[PDB]
A = this chain, B = another copy of it.
Amino acid sequence: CPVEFTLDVIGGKWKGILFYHMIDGKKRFNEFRRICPSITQRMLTLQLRELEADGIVHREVYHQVPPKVEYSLTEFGRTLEPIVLQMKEWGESNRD
């Protein structure tokens, strides 16, 4: 049940994928849609809201016209990295 804490935060279909893409740099909303396009505009937001609410992701709004929102991994969120990278390495090995 201490694994639960982590799984709430990072478990769940998408959280892992989203997170993975921010590892190598910040990302706008629409960059996520191009990547794993199966996700609905709604769902994407819910995840990013949750990740953000758990202090994993940092949402930054840029004072410009039009305004520009960019997402990126907080320092804390980075501590989930090793896990997430291992999730990736395993999914790759074990394809069928």
- Known contacts: A11-B12, A13-B11. The answer to whether A4 contacts B91 by CB under 8 A is yes
Residues of A participating in the B interface, judged by any CB pair closer than 8 Å: 1-14, 16-17, 20, 35-36, 38, 76, 79-80, 82-84, 86-88, 90-95
- The reply to whether B3 and A91 contact each other, CB–CB distance below 8 Å, is yes
CB neighbours (8 Å) of A76 from chain B are: 94
Cα–Cα, bound, A26→B11 (Å): 24
A86 and B83: CB pair below 8 A?
A: yes
Chain B residues contacting A20 (CB-CB under 8 Å) are 3
**A38 CB contacts on chain B under 8 angstroms:** 1
Chain B residues with CB below 8 A from A93, complex form = 79
Contacts of A86 in B (CB 8 A): 82-83, 86
For the complex, give the distance between the alpha carbons of A93 and B5 in Å.
11
CB distance from A90 to the nearest CB of B (A): 5
- Do B35 and A2 touch across chains, with their CB atoms under 8 A apart? no
